[PDB]
Amino acid sequence: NALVATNRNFQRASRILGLDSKLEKSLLIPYREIKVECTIPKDDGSLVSYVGFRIQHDNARGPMKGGIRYHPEVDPDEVNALAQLMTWKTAVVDIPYGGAKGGIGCNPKDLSISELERLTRVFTQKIHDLIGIHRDVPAPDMGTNSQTMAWILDEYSKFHGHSPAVVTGKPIDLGGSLGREAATGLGVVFATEALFAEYGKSISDMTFAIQGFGNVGTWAAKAIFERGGKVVAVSDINGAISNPNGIDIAALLKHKAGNGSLKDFSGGDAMNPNDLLVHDCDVLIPCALGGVLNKENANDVKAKFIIEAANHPTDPDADEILSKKGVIILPDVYANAGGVTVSYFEWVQNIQGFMWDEEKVNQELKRYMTKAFNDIKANCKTHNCDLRMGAFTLGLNRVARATLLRGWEA
Amino acid sequence: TNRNFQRASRILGLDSKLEKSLLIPYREIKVECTIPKDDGSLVSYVGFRIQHDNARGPMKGGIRYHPEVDPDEVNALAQLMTWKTAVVDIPYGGAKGGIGCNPKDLSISELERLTRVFTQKIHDLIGIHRDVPAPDMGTNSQTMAWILDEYSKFHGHSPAVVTGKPIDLGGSLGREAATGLGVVFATEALFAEYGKSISDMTFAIQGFGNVGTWAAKAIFERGGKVVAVSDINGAISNPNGIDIAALLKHKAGNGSLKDFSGGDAMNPNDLLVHDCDVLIPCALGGVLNKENANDVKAKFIIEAANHPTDPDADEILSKKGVIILPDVYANAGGVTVSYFEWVQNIQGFMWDEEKVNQELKRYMTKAFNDIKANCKTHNCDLRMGAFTLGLNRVARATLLRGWEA
Amino acid sequence: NALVATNRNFQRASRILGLDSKLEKSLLIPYREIKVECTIPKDDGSLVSYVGFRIQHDNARGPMKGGIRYHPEVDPDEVNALAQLMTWKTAVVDIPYGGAKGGIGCNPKDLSISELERLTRVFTQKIHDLIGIHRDVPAPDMGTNSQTMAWILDEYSKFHGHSPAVVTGKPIDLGGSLGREAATGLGVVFATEALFAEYGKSISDMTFAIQGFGNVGTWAAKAIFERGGKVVAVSDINGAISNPNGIDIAALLKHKAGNGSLKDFSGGDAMNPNDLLVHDCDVLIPCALGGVLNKENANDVKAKFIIEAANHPTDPDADEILSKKGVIILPDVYANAGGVTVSYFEWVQNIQGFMWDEEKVNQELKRYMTKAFNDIKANCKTHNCDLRMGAFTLGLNRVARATLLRGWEA
Amino acid sequence: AMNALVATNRNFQRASRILGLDSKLEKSLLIPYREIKVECTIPKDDGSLVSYVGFRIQHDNARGPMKGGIRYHPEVDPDEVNALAQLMTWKTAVVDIPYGGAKGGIGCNPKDLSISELERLTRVFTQKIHDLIGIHRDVPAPDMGTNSQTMAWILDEYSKFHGHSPAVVTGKPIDLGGSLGREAATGLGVVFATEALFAEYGKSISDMTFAIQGFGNVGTWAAKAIFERGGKVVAVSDINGAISNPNGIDIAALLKHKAGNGSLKDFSGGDAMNPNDLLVHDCDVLIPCALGGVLNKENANDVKAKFIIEAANHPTDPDADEILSKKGVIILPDVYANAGGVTVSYFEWVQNIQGFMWDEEKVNQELKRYMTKAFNDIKANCKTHNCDLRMGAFTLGLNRVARATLLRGWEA
């Protein structure tokens, strides 16, 4: 479905732009695909052999960027589609990168921490010439973390010198940026703020229902709460909580960190999490799974705004139903781009040799998200299209323009 | 097919974990190759390189410009080059690459631009001591000149980066004849073990192209009797020996084989089953199948073509009494002389053709001796002696390099 | 000494932290030691041969950094201690460097300016592949100066292109930073302000005695005076002056620029310099020699605060005595760090391709000095220790953390 | 014993005075081009950390890329590595191969480390010096405590940083571009050099009895080559014990015993002897093949051999030289007699650079050619300066380095 949704959005946007068929063919072909043998000794000395890989989709706008997944199931169509989508997404928010996606076909549950280190270092040895601060910047993904990136940094720097900017998502001690925890949820709020200004409204005039309460939902709920927004309902995997007068989100957060489930929180009524998406509210924010809005519940959605924080929460069936009802849907490719934008800031700070304080990180995040919204809005006017297509046409057109300007002669 | 590797793996008793590593390629690469056509419209192709193993040296192998690309065939071919270089003890591993395109669709200016863009996209992955490409289906010495010229912009003047070059740009002498002459060097060595010489024998030769012409020529000069030669149009037969010098002369005059008066035209389907001591398939593979294997008058088959001998015949032959010099060794004269080209280039100083053929004879002779010894150690036929030898050298090189990071 | 002080502080700090002994062993082994032949023709054509050297102690937190000494008496134990100290010091103030120290065993008085240039250039030819903008960044030291740095820059750049960030201490015209002359004395005053903020106090109306009146003391006294502080005593090697109402420091500096003697200044009374450290004041700032506070005068100190600007002005006996008297000692490794901090800023400005104005240098210096004090203070609470151990444990732990995150597999 | 660098510098001073070298040129030639000490920290097999310091001393490169081995031995320290690196500079000039001198090592006991720990240590050391070595820069090789397997690991790790580079190290396995003849080269060169010396007396290896200290790469192949030429090897020692037979030890049987993990003291074809008595054994020829400084003022007067062939580097210190000279003992110096190894290393490097290997007949033919030329040059130098063999070789090599240094010049 990453392939499904990305191909649907690409093909719609290509038709709106009237992209030349042969240019389109080139844009769908990855710059480079790499597979390398990664063999290490286990702690007891016996050999294990894996295949590492990196799909480098496009670099017309700058170095490639994307996660390293340590996971046993590798679908090449999915890896390829997510690298492509990162190319479009970086273009939507105007950060100077293209897309890439990589990983190792392994199960890290079966590897000791020393084996995981050796594996990471060997993988880095096999691809050091194909990545680089100005070439391809890896990041964490499923099965990898900031410790993984520290090992890439350390091994890479043997081949090319000290190079903090070669990976993002590093530990603070090795050049990681401040503000990364909050970046995605705070970015969702920044985007929502720019959207509501088009109506001369602000966060404080609105009620909100939030599906999911993890990294994205907690910080979004917090940033909404601090700006006057009333969060009337919140769900997660195990329950849901409701209050028409707004939930005290600071109290809810502290009830969470104390290991208290949503349903048995005092400042609200327990509700059925299956009712959250059709809950009475102005604004619905899916922050959990994709595919949650479809033909079966779209007609019962009450919000007038849907802020797509999760990946692909709205099926096309529901997209069309919801637009007809006049529902305004801020698309995922834009709305959840706070995380990737701050990872750009990490790279900048490393390149600059000089880290930013958190206030500057968040001022630049606000500036980037607001400008992207204005650019999306201007594209909707140009093409008389919805926000989702305003975004994809914006990102696709920037990649096409950069590609056409670079040209093709040898 | 993995049959030969699997057979040899079990003779050697290769460790399962080592075997798994040896089958995973070092690196597989695919790159976009987009060029403007002569009319400025774009065309996009995918170039690729499978770099199987470099335990024993830089990788080596052809670049195919051909539309049908099957990744499993490309991988098998890169792997076979790793074993084959090890059989004749030249310091390379195996690779194979290409561009999925039909060169007949492209002008020569378009093919040059495509070759140069491909080189631009892989220049950091190849190199004199990393991976050395060569011609293959759809490419030739002009293709290699373009790669050399473009690669040298990135890394300086680097003649050794490709083989099969034009002579004017560092190509070696002796390349035409290398494979067919190497076939005759290999069989001279084989027959030595039984106290016989080329002159002592009669030869039937299937095919009369780059391999067949040179093989028959070199046999004729060593006193062998060539009594039957096949090709596509016709065939000729003379049971006391064809005058090859004249048979070639007659080919230079667009002359067909049947029209050769120095013998009697025969049915080309009646060559593999012609009466002779030695049969040398030099045209197609899969010519010796189960049914037609019984109808074989020769006691020696020198495998010049690739896989001329179906695996059915391998069982039979041995029963019928036939000694099979296997293709992986017997036709390796061509790859051996491509190593010599590389050597001459990095030495900055070309050899004369006498030296090329001296070294070719030395390399083929030692490889046969190394193969025969292995056969005694493991007590196997010539095909497995060779495959065990090549696999074992790659395994040994890999084990000596080690596994720690 | 400077070797025994560093050893004693490293040792005490390592035991507060509980550093594993194998980790400690690694940390005290330098990354790399270099000795190179440096042979030049003298102006008359005859040869002279010297040994140049560079100890590169640690790079877990970033490129190495440190001075180049042209001096005949080379003690390897001292050079090594000074490289290690720089590793701890840069960590105390969160600058992204490790420590190094180098030099040439020569006497610059014996050498003409053209001989010194050729020697500098040959030394650069012999070590250029071992240093670098992201590898090891030299600086002036005893027997060298900004002109020496210009020659290193010029010769290095023949091998690597224009590389202004490869050395600090450069001439302004070749990328040197503004603000370097005031940096250490101003940094002392920023550090003092951060300390007194913890008591709800500002410098104004507090009284200061200052031992030494050179680069550090003059700028410290000026920065104090401009902030309303009362500088009631100043001494140097030739005399001392006092005024209980506060010396007009502007006038005193004007007097000293006319080569006037401290004891002769008209806006005060001559005093015996031996009575400075025991003068009646709120704040004592040793800005001259080390070891000036020992067991046989520590009991007669009357200040409540000591701001260590000189290297090791307080021996361990005095430390002991003054703690038991209730005296608060801001330690040298932190308090005089403004000079090393501004040399970091020079490197930043060079990397960024754009020099800062002086207001910006001083704003970032105040930010770095304040944040470092806040981190030290917090460390004192964590480990229940004094400011000196709070600073050393802070720097040593940052190096250890970075080393452990980087890991040990090859 | 005497400090190895004090000893070697004394020999350097004496040779400089024979040559009348300019004082400022002498001072420059003494000082090494580059000395490097690096931290080498690895996890052990159980995961715990151990830290060593590694050394690469690059003494002089006027005559070409620098050259010398890597020693893994507990006594490796800066003085020992500096002494060895300087001797490499003189020795490469003696045989006139286009190299300068370097040496490296790690203070460790390989006996105490597993094979995977030795591979990790070797790989980390290579990570720490890869930027200092190179085909045309500095070319290592195996010394005490290392072998061709160690070199394979250096080759493999180095090639990650600079691409496949067979000629970056010599002493490689044959499977990875090593030269036929290299493993046997130092022992065979010792025999070529000894035959040249004994011929000046009309004598042959078969006229002599031999005692050998050390039974590693040098001692084994030296014993084998002597044995195959009819020499009577009457005593052999190593670190664990020693064996003696006045009628001559069957060296082929001793090597088979060694191959089977047997100890010298247990070999049935001889009598166990105290290794501490090897150097004063009654023999015609003493060949030290182990550590340096082992002939000193404390035992030199008790040497009974009439010839000493220095297969080890710097086994005889200057005090012992004087004592032995007054006893009428002739010493074939390390800088000539043991140069077969670095000479065949040169051939290995040449073969790698040429991408085309030689057969063993050619290797050994060129080795004998180089050793013959050098002995004749040494003889001439002894006559010119009326000096002993050590100074004949030392001044030969020192003079060649000086000439090359003067040609290259001093401006920046």
Ligand SMILES: NC(=O)c1ccc[n+]([C@@H]2O[C@H](COP(=O)([O-])OP(=O)(O)OC[C@H]3O[C@@H](n4cnc5c(N)ncnc54)[C@H](O)[C@@H]3O)[C@@H](O)[C@H]2O)c1
């Ligand atoms: N594309 C991007 O760059 C990007 C960035 C960040 C997050 N996201 C998307 O945001 C979503 C959440 O990410 P996250 O980091 O917050 O995850 P997380 O794991 O931190 O939190 C997920 C939350 O969703 C809840 N949840 C899971 N299944 C649920 C269900 N069926 N009903 C209700 N609640 C459910 C969990 O209990 C938890 O509260 C995902 O779609 C993720 O892919 C996208």
Ligand SMILES: NC(=O)c1ccc[n+]([C@@H]2O[C@H](COP(=O)([O-])OP(=O)(O)OC[C@H]3O[C@@H](n4cnc5c(N)ncnc54)[C@H](O)[C@@H]3O)[C@@H](O)[C@H]2O)c1
């Ligand atoms: N593995 C290697 O490195 C290697 C090297 C060189 C050649 N070869 C093999 O050698 C064989 C021939 O190569 P070549 O260079 O001589 O080819 P070529 O194209 O120069 O000539 C091939 C000849 O085969 C003959 N021929 C073709 N179809 C025939 C048919 N149906 N019946 C009888 N004869 C027929 C004709 O004489 C034709 O000219 C092929 O199998 C090739 O793969 C292998």
Ligand SMILES: NC(=O)c1ccc[n+]([C@@H]2O[C@H](COP(=O)([O-])OP(=O)(O)OC[C@H]3O[C@@H](n4cnc5c(N)ncnc54)[C@H](O)[C@@H]3O)[C@@H](O)[C@H]2O)c1
């Ligand atoms: N570690 C660092 O990064 C760093 C940075 C700068 C300075 N420092 C320390 O600060 C000290 C002072 O530095 P500076 O640059 O101002 O030196 P400076 O040479 O500019 O001035 C030294 C001053 O001390 C006075 N003085 C010397 N001996 C004296 C004595 N016995 N009694 C009284 N006054 C005496 C001199 O007359 C002069 O006023 C340095 O020596 C060093 O200890 C440390």
Ligand SMILES: NC(=O)c1ccc[n+]([C@@H]2O[C@H](COP(=O)([O-])OP(=O)(O)OC[C@H]3O[C@@H](n4cnc5c(N)ncnc54)[C@H](O)[C@@H]3O)[C@@H](O)[C@H]2O)c1
């Ligand atoms: N390997 C070469 O090519 C080469 C070349 C020229 C010179 N050398 C010199 O030869 C000497 C030996 O080198 P190697 O390669 O044979 O080393 P190795 O590690 O292969 O063997 C050294 C031998 O010395 C023995 N030994 C160690 N300490 C001893 C002691 N105290 N008493 C007696 N025996 C002892 C060991 O047990 C072993 O038998 C060294 O001086 C070395 O520098 C080596």
Ligand SMILES: O=C(O)c1cccc(C(=O)O)n1
């Ligand atoms: O091949 C070499 O470089 C080498 C190796 C070990 C010792 C020596 C030596 O001491 O000459 N030279």
Ligand code: NA
């Ligand atoms: Na593309």
Ligand code: NA
């Ligand atoms: Na283990």
Ligand code: NA
């Ligand atoms: Na493999």
Ligand code: NA
């Ligand atoms: Na260290």
Ligand code: NA
């Ligand atoms: Na002059």
Ligand code: NA
């Ligand atoms: Na020197």
